[PDB]
């Protein structure tokens, strides 16, 4: 086994097809499936798995109520085979925390789990399934990472932190990571004003990095890292077609090195594909909440501030719950080319159901296809009623 | 590993001996089973595994009210050991979709599913379980494969597919497909007037499918694939020992190249193993429901209008349910011949016991002894009664 | 991976130390455990596993109604953990049916099940996970097997069947196996009038066997097999301390040659080891029903009419349900000896706990040491009551 | 694969971080969770996995009913994966009984369970999962072990058993077991008076023992063995930081070479690390009950009878239930040093909660840092009132 490199290009999106869906929250109605959020996609060499914070409980166990909340002893980052649900006894845990990424590297697999109360929050790194590195708070509000798949190349993981505020500047760094050892960090650069829950991928020795500006901004943040200098800059999408949530209206015309404006101290974890004409963007369909999900073509979105979708695909209809959404891919498949991946966060319950006390979700999943093909909608399936 | 090859002929089959049986709705009267349909068995080098289709809740889940549609973003073909329940926790996802098939070529497994809208459903090629290739629907008409094995050889594994009408003509199409790229494709030749549901078996560098014609057919179309040239014909069987549900009663003539008349627009999916005097024919025994299931040795039943049975074997009798059956062997097996294996879904609930939201199936699967073994009949054996 | 071979003697008995316990019906009283009953235990190079006959449902299931019964189209032959309880989840079936016996041959494990109607059943011959051999009832009256491990030696694996009835003269014979193929088989000879359920072990290329003689004999006819020379004698344990249940009191004289009477029709499953001076038998306490048990040593009991015991160990008070009890070894240990080792079935339920509808069991366990250690008494454990 | 040697130093330790919570109880509230006490960790050269006694039944199950009751046959050590409850269907049983230790030599693991009547106990060890040497009680007084992991030394793998008396002198004994085997056993020398439920951790060709004196003192009997001569020596911490429960207050000077008085024949299963100014003591917050726990920094507490704490740690509020307490390392990581480690069981139920009628635990477990992390508390979670 040798480290990856990211040797590939993106293949062609031509549209997008059905990859993995848990059904988690139908099934566990009757099963013993744990509470969950923040759930991701990430691929091992022989395997691609689910990921998520569990909240240490079964949605029918009577510890459900009150799993709206983000942070408690009671979370860890877990994972479990594809497709299936994340049950209490084909889970298993990586880390023990309530903020998390993961990526495997060629070789083995790094895992960070970030614990602690809100001003004494630490993180820590595990590689080959073992503890390895741990780095304190250094702003003392919330330490924070991305929430899905970090990647890595020629052994350098890099990962993107946030301590300090969400409604305001807030700390952000780079640590690039070997082996689960600190080979260098670095505080944010480029135009990006405030960063959440990046969404990366690689391809061609270069990380991108799509994230959240929880403070000001409706366009979402990129940041694009160099993984064998280990050096980044970050700016804006500049399209208009905006992609966080809540958001304004699109506008004509986006901005590239600000954030656009209309809305304040709040959004949702998301995701885009940035390749020139091959650009894709994920959103929730709804501006108000987190309902709906659509990924649209849009030629050049990171540079082009007039961007406007050419084409389009539905994945969960605007009547239908979605929720987080990142990015993965699967490094090792054979092939010319990187296929493009993208999970969804179906949330159900609290806020928005709350005759159930408990806050869950299911996953949707799917890569890209250089066809055409026909779409679907994707949503959880599970009746609220049958909770009560 | 090298790819196989259908090197052997089939063995004499003087019976059928008891190979698996998960009972699996007894099971999940109290315990975490999926609802499922449209089972199959499948072989790999090292192991043979149970498939069918998730419906993405347990039997005694709330959410199995309504199991009896065939369509929804809720179903998976899921894979799990010979002769266990398809459990929540014991249970494999291959691939999202309502509709499926699934083979190993010796080397690895490829795995189909189709998922969509009845207008726009696609077909998602997984080999090594990785997705590879894509296929949209051609005739916008519910696109829709086998519902059991496919089989390969020297790396060539054929595939026939279905999209169009369910109650007139329709188009057909067989895809030769290695490591989850298409060879080649060819639109359905010979005499078959309309295919559906093909079971397939492997002998002596040929594939035979028989099928289900939902048309006009009460004699069963059967597609001889020849998967080294890559083409193919088809006919019926020329018997009058008619092997659809419904069907008319058994006349004295068959016919060889058009449907046997008196049944339209409804079947079920059966198999056969042709093989001169070593000719099994499996049915139904009523011919108004699913119920009963029987084996006929009925020589030359492909060829010879006038063959009626010499031999028999009760599998379920005419007072217990059945439902969908097909064809699988174990191609890894040490031995002169390839045994010849089948499977028969055994359905419950829904339409026929209706006291009861759901539908679902257990699973009973026999393969042929060179002995005359005593008969069983092998019900699903739950009690409907105690989920009321 | 070779063939083993018997090349080493029993070591001393000094007395039994604890192996093995599932505490299955204690623990299914609140989880998914199948119900069962004939289990016993075997070993494979490099793990030994609990076997029993499942009956297709889980003690709180509805299904569990009638599992008194001994034959049902729903019962297989299961394997799983050591100590662990026989669940859903982690239940491996080895073959369908209601009369069983397993072993390894050093290379891969023979699994023999019979299933099928009392007048017409068959035995299906499993090796390396795969059918391989048939074999039809010869007496149309419930072909019946071990329900225990059976012994190889240079691939050759004796099994003993019956064929016949119960409660008069039947067919016993002996099918020397290979690779799950017939060597040959020969019709019982020796002293042995009838003969059931053989528990059976292997020491110096020799497999002694302990059966039980159903129809005249409260002593157990023992079964002698040369597995190289594929030939056998059989006779009785000489000794007064008579084995079988229920039984006449122990006289001072037993018999050799012939049935011990005073019992008809009737008896249970048990076992011995039988070398010379460190000679153990098992036996249930009383001698009117399944409860209690006890190890006595009988140095010379199988060739001495007179032998008594000269020490003995406790492992089921005589207030405490007991069943079926068996022989295994691990023939894999390292060391200068094989170590005996037994189970014993402790059955709950009916006939004699009728406040429940079901019949099931959890095992005990235990192996030979050559210290003097203490006893404990080792009860299933479950409060029938939480049942009602 | 080799034997491992203690070559390595502990790591220096300014904190500790998270390693693992299993969540059992908030979990067990709804799921099929076996009840347990006297839990630890344990590593082999692959994996990391959780340990404890189960009481054979889930905590929902009826027949948790009295599971404060230390021993029965219904008990047995089981092991499972790192951070999942123990269930019934992911735990794997290592032996029978109701006292326990177990470790990995390099090679393969040893366990040991002692079971049987508080007069008559026996002692089993099993290596590489099969049975290999017994030892009988030799005080006929509730034979028993450290209940948390041995460590081994180029194959040698020293263990601590007590036998005789709780509230009075005992016969204490190190046995030095190598592939199972004994090489060798000492009596207690030093001048430790009383010594119990040892926790055990090596390095640099030692092992350092931090025991329960439950006679007499309140400071820890210490035993450090030497693996290579396989010799030992023993006394108490010296420190006037008391490490018992329940303790007297802490006094300014502490004992060294007998039992720091005020509380007689109680105590509870706890651990250091005692290396020069690298010595941290673990202990329950409360002096009268098994609440809360700390880790304090008390440099060379081993030897200075006057040594105060310099930092602190805490791990559980003295408002959260705490218990047994022990060590464990990963001796197979990859670095200079070995990272100490350390579990706390969180007892719930009897006899503190006694609206249940139960007492079952939960994991917490934590390793060093050398970086100043940040402190939060980790409570068992769950809500008693849930259970009622
Ligand atoms: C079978 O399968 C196929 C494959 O899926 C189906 O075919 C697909 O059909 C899709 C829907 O019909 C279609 O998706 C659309 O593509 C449009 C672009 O194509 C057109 O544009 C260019 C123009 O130069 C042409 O090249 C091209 O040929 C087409 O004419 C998109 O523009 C669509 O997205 C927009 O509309 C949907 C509403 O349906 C919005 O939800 C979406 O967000 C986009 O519109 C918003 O944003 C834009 C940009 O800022 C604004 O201009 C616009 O006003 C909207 O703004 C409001 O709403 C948003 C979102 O809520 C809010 O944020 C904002 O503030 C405003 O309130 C759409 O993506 C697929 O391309 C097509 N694929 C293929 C291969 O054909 C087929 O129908 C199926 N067949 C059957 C039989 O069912
Ligand atoms: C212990 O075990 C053994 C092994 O299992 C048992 O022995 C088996 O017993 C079976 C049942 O007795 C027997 O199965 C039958 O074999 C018949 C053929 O054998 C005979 O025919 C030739 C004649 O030249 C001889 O060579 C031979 O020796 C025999 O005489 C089959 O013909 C039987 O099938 C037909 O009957 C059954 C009814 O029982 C139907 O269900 C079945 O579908 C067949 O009949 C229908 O179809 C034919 C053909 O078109 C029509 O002619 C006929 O009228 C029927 O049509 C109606 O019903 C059908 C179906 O519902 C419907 O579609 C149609 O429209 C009409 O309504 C049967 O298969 C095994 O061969 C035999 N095996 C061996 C090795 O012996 C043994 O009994 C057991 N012993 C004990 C002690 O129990
Ligand atoms: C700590 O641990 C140790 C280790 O376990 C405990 O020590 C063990 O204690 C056992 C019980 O005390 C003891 O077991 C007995 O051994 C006897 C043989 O030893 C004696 O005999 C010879 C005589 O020449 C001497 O060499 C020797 O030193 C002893 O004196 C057995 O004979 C005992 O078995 C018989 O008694 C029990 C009743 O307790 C029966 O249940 C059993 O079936 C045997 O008796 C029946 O059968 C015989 C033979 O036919 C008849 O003679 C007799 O009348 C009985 O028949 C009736 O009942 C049977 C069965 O129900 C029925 O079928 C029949 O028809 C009649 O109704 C017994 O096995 C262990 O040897 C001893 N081990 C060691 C190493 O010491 C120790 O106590 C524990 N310590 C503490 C502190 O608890
Ligand atoms: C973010 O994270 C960091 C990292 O966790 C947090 O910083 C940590 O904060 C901890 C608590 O504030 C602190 O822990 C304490 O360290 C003390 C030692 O440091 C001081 O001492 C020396 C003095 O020469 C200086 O070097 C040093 O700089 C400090 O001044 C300990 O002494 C503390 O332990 C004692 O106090 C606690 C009460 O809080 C007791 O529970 C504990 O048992 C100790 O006190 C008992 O025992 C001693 C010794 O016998 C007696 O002297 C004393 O009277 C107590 O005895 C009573 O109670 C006990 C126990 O119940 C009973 O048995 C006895 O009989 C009596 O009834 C404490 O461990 C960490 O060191 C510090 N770490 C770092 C790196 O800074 C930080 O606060 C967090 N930040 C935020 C923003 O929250
Ligand atoms: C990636 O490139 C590095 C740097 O030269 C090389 O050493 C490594 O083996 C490559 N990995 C693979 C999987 O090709
Ligand atoms: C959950 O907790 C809230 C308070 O935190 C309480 O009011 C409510 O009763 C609980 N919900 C249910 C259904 O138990
Ligand atoms: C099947 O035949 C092909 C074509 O010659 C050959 O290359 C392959 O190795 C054969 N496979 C096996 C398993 O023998
Ligand atoms: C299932 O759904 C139907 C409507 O779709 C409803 O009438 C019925 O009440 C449900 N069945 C049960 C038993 O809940
Ligand atoms: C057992 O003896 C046979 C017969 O000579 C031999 O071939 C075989 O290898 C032996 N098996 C082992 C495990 O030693
Ligand atoms: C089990 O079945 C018997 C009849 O076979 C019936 O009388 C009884 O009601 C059933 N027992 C229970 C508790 O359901
Ligand atoms: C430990 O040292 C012994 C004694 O010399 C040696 O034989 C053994 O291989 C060493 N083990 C390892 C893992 O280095
Ligand atoms: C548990 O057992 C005790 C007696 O041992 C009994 O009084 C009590 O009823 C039982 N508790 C429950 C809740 O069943
Ligand atoms: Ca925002
Ligand atoms: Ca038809
Ligand atoms: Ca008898
Ligand atoms: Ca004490």
Excluded at 32 to 53: G, Q
Excluded at 242 to 266: A, E, S
Excluded at 371 to 384: M, R
Aim: charged share 20%; net charge neutral.
């Amino acid at each position: 086994r040798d480290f990856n490199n990211l040797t590939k290009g993106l293949c062609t999106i031509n549209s997008w097809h059905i990859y993995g869906k848990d059904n988690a929250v139908r099934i566990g109605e009757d099963s013993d499936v744990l509470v969950t959020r923040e759930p991701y996609v990430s691929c091992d060499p022989d395997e691609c798995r689910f990921y998520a914070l569990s909240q240490g409980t079964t949605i029918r166990g009577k510890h459900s109520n009150g799993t709206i909340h983000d942070r408690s002893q009671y979370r860890a980052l877990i994972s479990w085979p594809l497709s299936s649900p994340p049950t209490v006894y084909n889970s298993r845990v990586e880390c023990i925390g309530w903020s998390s990424t993961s990526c495997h590297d060629g070789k083995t697999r790094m895992s960070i789990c970030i614990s602690g109360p809100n001003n004494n929050a630490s993180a820590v790194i595990w590689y080959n399934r073992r503890p390895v590195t741990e780095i304190n708070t250094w702003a003392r509000n919330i330490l924070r990472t991305q929430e899905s798949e970090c990647v890595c190349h020629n052994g350098v993981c890099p990962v993107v932190f946030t301590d300090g505020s969400a409604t305001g500047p807030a700390e952000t760094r780079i640590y690039y990571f070997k082996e689960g050892k600190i080979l260098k960090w670095e505080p944010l650069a480029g135009t990006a004003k405030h960063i959440e829950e990046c969404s990366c991928y690689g391809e061609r020795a270069e990380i991108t990095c799509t994230c959240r500006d929880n403070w000001q901004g409706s366009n979402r943040p990129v940041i694009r890292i160099d993984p064998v200098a280990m050096t980044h800059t970050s700016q804006y999408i500049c399209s208009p077609v905006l992609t966080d949530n809540p958001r304004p209206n699109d506008p004509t015309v986006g901005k590239c090195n600000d954030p656009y404006p209309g809305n304040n101290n709040n959004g949702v974890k998301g995701f885009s594909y940035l390749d020139g004409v091959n650009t894709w963007l994920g959103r929730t369909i709804s501006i108000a909440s987190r309902s709906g999900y659509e990924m649209l073509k849009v030629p050049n979105a990171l540079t082009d501030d007039k961007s406007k979708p050419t084409q389009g695909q539905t994945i969960v209809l605007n009547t239908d719950w979605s929720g987080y959404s990142g990015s993965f891919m699967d490094y090792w498949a054979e092939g010319e080319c990187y296929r493009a991946c993208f999970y969804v966060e179906l949330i159900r319950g609290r806020p928005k159901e709350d005759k159930v006390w408990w806050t869950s979700n299911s996953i949707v999943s799917m890569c890209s296809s250089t066809e055409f093909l026909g779409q679907w909608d994707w949503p959880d399936g599970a009746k609220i009623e049958y909770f009560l």
